[PDB]
C-alpha cells in the first residue's frame, strides 16, 4: 500500500513542562508575551465564564502537574486562529493545575455553535488536549455544558459515544466562583467515571 | 476566521507510544482503560492557532543569551536546527516550535527538581521560534546533561530537549523529545522505550551536523519533525 | 634501589599512532625523519619511579571538590574508573594515574586556551591517584565538552580526558586519551585518526558503566588500560 | 603465533599538558606535593649540576610546549625508585619549556655509571622522554656528557648508533649558568642535526 | 553486628519474569497493579543472615539417605552441583542453598499434592547445605518426574528442582527453579515462560556433567547460580 | 556499555514451598535445627511483640500458601547476622500462612531505629519478603508500627511513597492478643488498598 | 551525522591549461572577450601598480606552466563582482608564467582595507589561487605589501600564521619597473621559504 513519511512519535511532556509552557508556574520569570489562560478581554462579545477543573489518576489522586491546551469557537461560532494578545478574543489558550490544589482555570466566553462536516450543528464545546508526566501521547476530550441539554442530546459527536452514561463524563457543571458564572469540568483519566477521550 | 478545508492523515497509534507502558511507572495510573472514541474531522479538529502575530523577544530562540545574569552558560554550545514537514513532505511554514531542557548537568530550573547538580546562573532552559517560510527553525543552546529520576532504582534520562510543535491544526499539534546521536543511555530509558518500534525511536535522534557548526564557536545538531499529512477534502457529502 | 629483573614486550609501533600523521597538522614538523634506534633493555629502561610514598591530598582524585571556590562544578557528574593490567593480564598495583581535561563546555583552565566558552569557577581540571592492590583506580569528575581547535577549518576534539600512567618502568610509561562511548565526533578527529587501526581506536573508548553509577547522583564510565607485558629474564648471558 | 592483549595506544599529550603535569606553568595553583625539576636536595651526594635545553621542530622553531620526564642513576650509580619529596635524591623528575624562551631546566647531580644487561659499563647518562602537542607517541633519548669522552667512546648503547655523527647529537655541552656547572642539551626533533631517538 | 559497606547491582526486572504473566493463571490475581516503589539501599537492604553456625544434619544435602525408611528411593540417582557467584564473577562462600522437589514420579510429599502417582516411602524431597569456601555446593538426589498441574487443561511441569539461595544480603536472596538439559517440556511450561527472554530461560537449565558422575552409581548435573553483583560504596554523601 | 553476568532469573516458589522451607506446614517431620518464626527467646532485651497478618489476592480472597521472610534490627537498632538458634535474638525469621485460617505469626521484639545511608533515622521497621504460588519474583515490603506516628511521619523511606494514602498500607495496627502486645499486618497484593512493594 | 552531497573532487589543471584559460599563451587565437591580467584601466581610482612574480618547485626550479587567478578589493576596499571588460576596474583577473622566463604580471590598483567577519580590519591583500601540472588541488595564498608594515602587523589573517618567519613569505617587495611602482611576489611551493597556503 501507499506509505507516507511516518509522523514524529509523541513523548510525555514530563513533570517540568512548565519551564517551557507555563513559566510563572515553574517558578520562573515570564517573557513579554505568553500564551495563557485568558481567552477574552473584558470587552469581548458573548457570555463571559470561568472554567475550572481538577484531574484524577486511576487511584483517585490529583494529577498536580497537568498541562492543558484549549481550542474553542467565539460567541458567534467563529474560530479565531490569528493568535494575538491584542485580540478581544483568542480561540486558543493554555492552562495548568496548581501544585497545591491541583486546579486549573481558564477565563473565556461560552462558545457559539458550529456545524460538523456534514452540516449538522454540534452542541457548544471546548476542545481540550491534556498533557502530563505519565501521559505518553496527549489525550483529546471535549467540554460541553450542562445548561445546553437540548443541544447536547442532538450533538452528532456526543452521539458517537455508544453508552449514554459515558456521554455524562463530558458535561461540565454550571456553578459560581466568587459569585461569577462558572463551569467545573473534572477529568478522570482512568477507572470509575473515566472521561471519554477521542481519536481523530 | 478559520475554515474547514483540509483533512489530516489518521495517526498510527502503534507508531506513537501507547498509553500503558508500565516500565515508565507513572503511565500505569495515568493511562485510560477505555478505548479512545473515534470521531470524524470537523472544523473543531482541522483548524488551530497560528502564531504569526505573537510578539517574540530578540533572544527567544537563543538560550545562551535569554537568561543573561552577567555571563555565558557553562556547557557544550550547540545550534539545534531542522525542518518541519508533513507526511506528504510539504514544509510547514510559520509554525510555532517551543523547546525546554535541563542545564549542562541535568538540572532543571523548576521548583520541583531537587537533583543535587547545581543550577547555572546564566541558563534558563526555554526557547521558542516560528519556522521560516521554508519550514526551517533554529535555536542556540547548551547540550543538556542526563537527568536521574525516580522510576527504577537507577534510571537516567538520556540528554534530551523537549519539543512542542503546533502545526496547522489542533489535530497536528505534538509534544515530543529530541535525543542525541550515539547516546548510550537511549536504549535504556523506559520513556524512550514507551515507543515499541525501534525505527520510530530513530526518528527522535538528532544527528551531529558539522556543516551547520560555527568553527571555534559552537557545534550543531539537526532534528527534523514530521507532522500529520494534510490534504484537501474530496467527494464529501455526495 | 631499583634492580634489572624483568623484560617488557616490544611495542607494536603500527598499533600505536605513527609519528607522521599529516592530517594532525602539528605532527608534520614534530615527527622525526630518521628511524628510531633500537636498543636492548638494561636497568635504565626496565626500572622507573614508584609513587607509593607521594603525598596525595584528600581530593586529588575528585574534580568535583578539588577546585572548590564556593560551589559544585556545572556539568554531567561522572565516575571514571577502571583497571590497569599488563599485556599478560596481570594487574598493575600501586601505579600512578594522572588525568586532566576541559570543563563541561570544552574550555581548559590553561592560560593558552582562549576558546570563547566560559571557565567554571568551581572546576580546575586535574586529577591523580594510585591504583589499588588489585590494579583499580577511580576519579570523580564532570564529563568534558568537545573543544574546537585550529587544525582544519572546522575541527573539534571529541569529549576526552587525558591520561598518563607510570607503570613499573620508564618502558611502560604511557600518555593517552580516553573518549566516550558513541560520541559521533570520534571518527572525525585527526588526533584519534593518528591511530591507523580502528580496533586500536576502540581500546580508547570508555563504556557507560551503569553498575558503577550512584543513583540520583552521578553516572560512571569504565576505562581499562593495558601496559606492556612484563616477564622475568631467561637464558641471558649464556 | 601467540598474541597478548594489545597495549593501550598512545595519544599526544596536547598543548595543555601543563594543567595535569606542570600546574604552575599552566597558570594554576599547585598541590601540596608536585613531581618536578629538582632531583637533588643541596645535601645529596655527588656533583650538583644544572641541565637546560631548548627543543626544535623541523623548521628550526622552538617547541614552546614540550614536557620532559627524566630518569637517572644517583652519583653512586643507583636508581632511586622510591619517589619521595623528602629524599635527598630522586632518580625521577619532570620539567617543561617556558613559553617565552622555550627553555627547560632540571637541578640534579651527575649520574654514576651502571652496567647494561651483559655487564658492560654504560657512560654516564640521563634517560629522557619527550612529550608535546604534535608528538603522537613520546620520544626516548639519552643525555650524555661531553667531559666523559673516554666513557662515551666505549658506551655499548652509543655504539649501537651506526653513524659517529649521529652519536654527537646525544652529547650535552658543559657550560656555566650564573657561574654554576651546567650542561646544555638541545633536542632537534627533525631535520639537520636530528637527535637520535630510541626504541626499546 | 552487620554493617552497610556494600551496594548491589540493581535488578533487571525484564530479565526476571514480570509479575503479571497471565498464561500462568495464578499470577493474574497475585501480581501488584501499582508500580514498585524504588528506594535507595540502606543497612536494612544490604545486610542479611549468615548461616555458618546453623547446625546441619549428616544427610541434610543427601536425599538418598535423609528420608530413610528401610531402603533407597527409586529413581535416577544424580548429584546436583555447581557454584554460586555474583555478577562480577566473585564466588559466594558459606551461603545457604536450599532445595526441594517431587519424587521420581512427579509426586510431592505435601498433603496438598493429590496427584495419583505414588509417594516413595524412602524419599522426602528436601535438602540444604552451605556453599564451601570457593562457592561450591553439592546435593545427591533422585531426578524428579514431570508434575501435572491445574493450569491449562494439559499442563505439566518439566522435571524441576526448586532452589533458594540467601547470598550476602536480603537484597541478593533468590528463589528459582532448576530444569534439566534437553527436557522437551521446558518450552511448553507457562512457569518457565513467565521469563520473556529465552537466554534467561537457558540460565535455569542444568547441564549433564559426566565429569562429576560416579561410574556404576550416579550421574551428575551442573547448575551454577549468579547473585546480584556486590561492590563497595564510593563517593557517597560528598 | 558494561554488561555483567546476568542474575539467575527468579521463579515462583510454588504451592509446595513448605516442604523445603516450612517443614511442619507441609505435614512433614522437622530436622534438628529449623529457621522459623521465633526471633526472640523470652530473655531478649526489648519490648516483646506478637506479629500476625493475613494475605489477600486481587479478588480479596485469602492467600493460604504464602511464605514470608523477615529481617529486622534488635531493640538497640542493630542487625544481627550471625544466625544461631542459641542466640537470645536473631534478626532473621520465616513464617507461613495456615492453610485453614490463612494467618501467619511471628514472635519478636520491636526493632530500634536505624539510620539510612545519608544518616537520616528511619522509623522502626521489619523488612518482609513475600513468596507464593503465582508470585514470580518475591515482593518486598516494610512493616512499620502505628504507635510510632512521629517517627513514621519523618521516615525517609515512607516519604518516598508519593501518595500519603499509600503510606498507610505499611502501618501495622497495635492490639492485644491474650494480654500480650500484638500488631496486625495484612498485605493486599492487588487492587483496593494494595500494599506498597519496594524495588531496591 | 548529517552527510551532504560530496563535492566534485579536484584534478590537476595539467600542462595545457592555457588552451582553455590563457589562450595567447597556448600559441592560440583569442576570442572577442577574454578574462586576463589587466584589472584596472588607466582611468581607475587608486594607486596603479604592476605586480610580478616567479613560481618555484621544491628543487628551486621555475614552474613555467603556472596559471594564477586573483581576487581583490578596489582602492576603496570594496569587492566588485559584476565582471565586465567595459569596467574601469574588475576585482577578478587571471595570469600565467611565460614558458621562457617563468614570470607572470598583473596590472591593477592597490586594494583598500577590508574588515573580516568579526569587524577587524585586514591589511591590504590580493587573494591568489595557483594551478599547474603537478598541483592536484589549487593552492590558496595572499599577497600583502611591504609598505603596509603597520597594517600587516595587525592583520587578523597574518596573525593566524603561528611562526612570524612564515608571515614574511606573504609580503610582496616594492620596487620600480620603468618608472612605475611595482611589487614582486615570488611563490615557493615547497621547501626552504615555502609560501604559506590557506584552507578556508
Ligand atoms: O517523569 N518523567 O516523565 C520525567 C522525568 C524526568 C525528565 O527529564 C522527563 O523528561 C520526564
Ligand atoms: O593540538 N592538540 O594537540 C590538541 C588541541 C586541543 C586538545 O584538546 C588536545 O587534546 C590536543
Ligand atoms: O525458552 N526455552 O524454552 C528454552 C530455552 C533454552 C533451552 O535450552 C531450552 O531447552 C528451552
Ligand atoms: O502453581 N504452581 O506454581 C506450581 C504447581 C506445581 C509445581 O510443581 C510448581 O513448582 C508450581
Ligand atoms: O602531467 N599532467 O598533468 C598531464 C599530462 C597530460 C594531460 O593530458 C593532463 O591532463 C595532465
Ligand atoms: Cl489527591
Ligand atoms: Cl540571539
Ligand atoms: Cl573526595
Ligand atoms: Cl623559534
Ligand atoms: Cl570450605
Ligand atoms: Fe526532561
Ligand atoms: Fe585535550
Ligand atoms: Fe514444583
Ligand atoms: Fe589533459
How would you summarize what this structure contains?
Chain A has 4 helices and 10 strands. Chain A is mostly beta strands and 200 residues long.
Task: Report on the architecture of this protein.
This is part of a larger assembly, with four copies of chain A (200 residues) and three copies of chain B (238 residues). By secondary structure, chain A is mainly beta. Chain A is built from four helices and ten strands. Chain A has helices at residues 18-21, 23-26, 149-154, 164-167, and strands at 48-56, 67-72, 92-96, 103-109, 126-131, 139-145, 171-177, 180-184, 187-188, 198-199. The two termini of chain A are 22 Å apart. Chain B has a single domain (1-238), classed as Aromatic compound dioxygenase (Protocatechuate 3,4-Dioxygenase, subunit A, Sandwich), CATH 2.60.130.10. The two termini of chain B are 26 Å apart. At the C-F interface, loops of C face loops of F. β10 of chain A pairs parallel with β2 of chain B. Bound molecules: 4-nitrocatechol (4NC) (5 copies), chloride ion (5 copies) and fe (iii) ion (FE) (4 copies). Chains A, D, F, G: Its EC number is 1.13.11.3. Chains A, D, F, G: 3,4-dihydroxybenzoate binds at residue 133. Chains A, D, F, G: Its cofactor is Fe(3+). Chains A, D, F, G: Keywords: Aromatic hydrocarbons catabolism, Dioxygenase, Iron, Oxidoreductase.
Total discrete domains of chain B:
1
Question: Approximately what portion of the residues of chain B adopt beta-strand conformation?
Answer: 25-35%
Helix coverage percent of residues of chain B?
A: under 10%
Q: Over all CA atoms, what is the radius of gyration of chain B?
A: 19 Å
Output the number of helix runs of chain A. 4
**What is the level 1 CATH name of chain B?**
Mainly Beta
| Overall geometry of chain A | globular
CATH domain topology of chain B: Protocatechuate 3,4-Dioxygenase, subunit A
N-end to C-end Cα span of chain B: 26 Å
Counting H and I runs of at least 4 residues, what is the number of helices of chain B? 2
| String of helices and strands of chain B | EEHEEEEEEEEHEEEE
> Strand pairing plus helix content of chain A: what structural class?
mainly beta
Number of strands of chain A: 10
Strand content of chain A: 25-35%
CATH level-four homologous superfamily name of chain B:
Aromatic compound dioxygenase
GO molecular function (chains B, C, E): ferric iron binding; protocatechuate 3,4-dioxygenase activity
Family (chains B, C, E): Belongs to the intradiol ring-cleavage dioxygenase family.
Keywords (chains B, C, E): Aromatic hydrocarbons catabolism, Dioxygenase, Iron, Metal-binding, Oxidoreductase
Pathway (chains B, C, E): Aromatic compound metabolism; beta-ketoadipate pathway; 3-carboxy-cis,cis-muconate from 3,4-dihydroxybenzoate: step 1/1
Amino acid at each position: 500500500p501507499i506509505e507516507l513519511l511516518p509522523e514524529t512519535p509523541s513523548q510525555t511532556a514530563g513533570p517540568y513542562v512548565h519551564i517551557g509552557l507555563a513559566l510563572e508556574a515553574a517558578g520562573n520569570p515570564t517573557r513579554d508575551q505568553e500564551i495563557w489562560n485568558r481567552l477574552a478581554k473584558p470587552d469581548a462579545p458573548g457570555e463571559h465564564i470561568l472554567l475550572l477543573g481538577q484531574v484524577y489518576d486511576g487511584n483517585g489522586h490529583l494529577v498536580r502537574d497537568s498541562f492543558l491546551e484549549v481550542w474553542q469557537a467565539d460567541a458567534n461560532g467563529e474560530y479565531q486562529d490569528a493568535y494575538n494578545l491584542e485580540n478581544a478574543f483568542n480561540s486558543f489558550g493554555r492552562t495548568a493545575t496548581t501544585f497545591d490544589a491541583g486546579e486549573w482555570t481558564l477565563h473565556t466566553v461560552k462558545p457559539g455553535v458550529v456545524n460538523n462536516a456534514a452540516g449538522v450543528p454540534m452542541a457548544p464545546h471546548i476542545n481540550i488536549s491534556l498533557f502530563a508526566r505519565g501521559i505518553n501521547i496527549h489525550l483529546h476530550t471535549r467540554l460541553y455544558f450542562d445548561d445546553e441539554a437540548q443541544a447536547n442530546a442532538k450533538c452528532p459527536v456526543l452521539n458517537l459515544i455508544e453508552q449514554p452514561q459515558r456521554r455524562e463524563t463530558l458535561i461540565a457543571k454550571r456553578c459560581e466562583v466568587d459569585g461569577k458564572t462558572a463551569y467545573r469540568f473534572d477529568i478522570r483519566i482512568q477507572g470509575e467515571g473515566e472521561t471519554v477521550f477521542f481519536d481523530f | 476566521p478559520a475554515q474547514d478545508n483540509s483533512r489530516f492523515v489518521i495517526r498510527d497509534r502503534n507508531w506513537h507510544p501507547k498509553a500503558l507502558t508500565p516500565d515508565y511507572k507513572t503511565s500505569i495510573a495515568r493511562s485510560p482503560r477505555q478505548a479512545l472514541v473515534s470521531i470524524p474531522q470537523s472544523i473543531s479538529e482541522t483548524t488551530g492557532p497560528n502564531f504569526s502575530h505573537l510578539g517574540f523577544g530578540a533572544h527567544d530562540h537563543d538560550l545562551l543569551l535569554n537568561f543573561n545574569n552577567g555571563g555565558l552558560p557553562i556547557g557544550e554550545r550547540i545550534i539545534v536546527a531542522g525542518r518541519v514537514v508533513d507526511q506528504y513532505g510539504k514544509p510547514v511554514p510559520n509554525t510555532l516550535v517551543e523547546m525546554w531542557q535541563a542545564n549542562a548537568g541535568g538540572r532543571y530550573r523548576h521548583k520541583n527538581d531537587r537533583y543535587l547538580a547545581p543550577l547555572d546562573p546564566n541558563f534558563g532552559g526555554v526557547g521558542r521560534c516560528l519556522t521560516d517560510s521554508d519550514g526551517y527553525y533554529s535555536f542556540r543552546t547548551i547540550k543538556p546533561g542526563p537527568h536521574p529520576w525516580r522510576n527504577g532504582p537507577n534510571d537516567w534520562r538520556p540528554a534530551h530537549i523537549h519539543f512542542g510543535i503546533s502545526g496547522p491544526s489542533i489535530a497536528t499539534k505534538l509534544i515530543t523529545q529530541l535525543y542525541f546521536e550515539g547516546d548510550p543511555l537511549i536504549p535504556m530509558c523506559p520513556i524512550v522505550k514507551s515507543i515499541a518500534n525501534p525505527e520510530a525511536v530513530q526518528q527522535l535522534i538528532a544527528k551531529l551536523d558539522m556543516n551547520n557548526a560555527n568553527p571555534m564557536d559552537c557545534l550543531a545538531y539537526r532534528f527534523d519533525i514530521v507532522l500529520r499529512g494534510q490534504r484537501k477534502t474530496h467527494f464529501e457529502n455526495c
